[PDB]
C-alpha cells in the first residue's frame, strides 16, 4: 500500500479548511494573538458562509492560473529510507484486510442478541465506544454485523454508538513486506498582501494539529516535524510581488506489499523406519 502523502494532504485540507473558515468563533481563537486590524480584515474577507472571497488549494506547475489573492500550494519534496526490519517483514495476517473505518450504528433487537450493522464486512473489530464486553456477553462478529447477547443489557435496545472496524476482502492469509520511509513535503501560502499570508500560515498550523487526531494520521502518518522558512517574495516580475512563507512537513510511513501464502499444511502422517 504505497502512500501518496500529497493526496492525503489535499483530502484532509479541503474539507477541514472550509469548515474552519465557515465559523467565526474558531477563527478568533486561532487569530487570538494577531492585532485587531489584520484579524478582522481577514475575517471580513474569507470568514463566514457568506464570504465572497474564497481560498483555493492546488499542486505545483498547473497550466491554468491560481487565485493569487489567497492560495495553498503543495509540492512533493524529498524522501528517504530510515529503518528496516529482518527479511523486510512488517506483519503477518490471516485475513486480507483493507482500510480501517469508523462507523456509527444503532443497536437492533434480535431474540437472543442486540446487533449493530455496518456498511461492509467487519473483519477485525477494534473497539465499540465505551463498551467492555464481558465473556457472558459473548461478543462475536458475523458478516457485516457485530452481536452481543441481550440479557442484563435490556435497557440498550436503542443504544447509539460509534464502531471502529476494518475492511475484510479475502480469507487468503499472507505476509507483509516493506520498510519505513521518512518523507518531506512542502506547503506554502501565497498572496500579494503579506498580512494575509501570515494569517493564512497560522490557520494552516491549527489544522495540522487537528490532523494529529485523525485516523489516517494516527495509524499511517506519524511523527510530525514542522519547519518554517522566511517570508520571501516569490515573484518580482509583475505589477506587485507575491509573498509566501514556505513550510516543510515530515512524515514516517510504511511502503508495504502483500505476499500471499498457499502452502497450508492440513495433513500430518508419521511413519516409522523399516529397520
Amino acid at each position: 500500500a504505497i502512500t501518496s502523502v500529497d493526496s492525503y494532504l489535499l483530502s484532509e485540507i479541503k474539507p477541514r479548511l472550509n469548515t474552519v473558515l465557515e465559523n467565526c468563533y474558531i477563527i478568533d481563537e486561532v487569530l487570538k494573538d494577531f492585532d485587531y486590524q489584520t484579524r478582522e480584515s481577514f475575517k471580513e474577507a474569507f470568514c463566514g458562509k457568506n464570504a465572497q472571497h474564497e481560498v483555493t488549494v492546488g499542486f505545483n506547475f498547473p497550466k491554468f492560473k491560481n487565485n493569487y489573492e489567497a492560495h495553498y500550494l503543495i509540492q512533493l519534496g524529498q524522501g528517504q529510507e530510515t529503518k528496516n526490519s529482518l527479511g523486510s517483514i512488517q506483519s503477518s495476517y490471516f485475513e486480507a484486510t483493507g482500510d480501517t473505518l469508523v462507523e456509527s450504528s444503532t443497536a437492533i433487537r434480535e431474540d437472543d442478541k442486540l446487533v449493530f450493522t455496518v456498511s461492509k464486512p467487519i473483519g477485525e473489530l477494534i473497539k465499540v465506544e465505551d463498551i467492555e464486553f464481558a465473556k457472558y456477553d459473548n461478543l462475536q462478529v458475523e458478516g457485516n454485523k457485530v452481536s452481543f447477547k441481550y440479557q442484563t443489557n435490556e435497557d440498550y435496545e436503542n443504544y447509539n454508538a460509534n464502531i471502529i472496524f476494518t475492511e475484510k476482502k479475502n480469507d487468503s492469509k499472507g505476509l507483509v513486506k516493506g520498510f519505513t520511509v521518512e518523507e518531506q513535503v512542502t506547503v506554502v501560502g501565497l498572496s500579494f498582501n503579506v498580512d494575509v499570508a501570515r494569517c493564512l500560515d497560522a490557520v494552516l498550523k491549527m489544522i495540522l494539529i487537528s490532523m494529529r487526531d485523525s485516523i489516517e494520521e494516527q495509524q499511517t502518518f506519524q511523527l510530525q516535524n514542522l519547519s518554517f522558512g522566511d517570508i520571501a517574495p516569490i515573484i518580482e516580475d509583475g505589477d506587485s510581488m507575491i509573498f509566501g512563507r514556505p513550510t516543510i512537513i515530515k512524515y514516517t510511513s510504511s511502503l508495504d506489499l502483500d505476499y500471499t501464502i498457499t502452502q497450508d499444511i492440513n495433513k500430518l502422517t508419521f511413519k516409522e523406519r523399516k529397520d
Binding site: 500500500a1 495476517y93 482500510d99 480501517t100 477494534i126 489516517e216 494516527q218 499511517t220 506519524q222 510530525q224
Partner: protein, 141 residues
C-alpha cells in the same frame, strides 16, 4: 489509506494518565522487569538442566518538564520529606490516544527517587522513578 495490520505505537498515539488526570508535557517513560531466572547445574553436566523464576523486580521512570502548575510536587503524587509517609499507592496508566483503550497499567506504584535539574540554557526537567507491585495488560477489546 490505513491498513491497521501494520500500525505501531508512537509518541503521538499514547497518553500518560494518573488518577484520570493526563500529566502534561511528559517526555519519556521506561519500564523494567526482572524475573531473576537462574539455572540448575548437576554434577554430571555443564549444561543447565532447567531454569526457574525466583524474584520479580520492576521499576518505571518518568521524565517531565516542570510546569508552573500541577508539577508532581504540587499534585501530591511525589513528596519532599516526611509527607511521603502519608502518600498512598497510585496506578499509572498508558492509554491509547485513538480509542482510549488501555495498553499497559502499573498497579501499586510507589516512588523510589526524585530528580530535578535547574539549568540556564534549557527548560527545567524533573525525573521520577517508581517501584510497582504488579503490571497488567487487561481490559483489551
Amino acid at each position: 489509506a490505513s491498513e491497521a495490520k501494520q500500525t505501531v505505537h508512537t509518541g503521538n498515539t499514547v497518553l500518560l494518565m494518573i488518577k484520570g488526570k493526563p500529566v502534561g508535557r511528559a517526555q519519556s517513560a521506561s519500564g523494567q522487569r526482572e524475573y531473576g531466572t537462574t539455572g540448575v547445574y548437576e554434577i554430571g553436566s555443564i549444561m543447565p538442566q532447567e531454569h526457574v523464576y525466583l524474584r520479580y523486580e520492576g521499576t518505571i521512570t518518568v521524565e517531565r518538564l516542570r510546569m508552573k502548575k500541577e508539577n508532581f510536587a504540587d499534585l501530591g503524587y511525589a513528596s519532599l520529606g516526611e509527607e511521603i509517609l502519608k502518600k498512598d499507592i497510585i496506578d499509572i496508566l498508558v492509554v491509547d490516544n485513538l480509542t482510549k483503550q488501555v495498553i499497559i497499567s502499573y498497579h501499586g506504584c510507589s516512588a523510589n527517587n526524585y530528580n530535578e535539574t535547574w539549568q540556564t540554557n534549557e527548560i527545567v526537567t524533573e525525573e521520577i522513578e517508581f517501584s510497582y507491585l504488579t503490571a497488567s495488560d487487561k481490559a483489551r477489546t
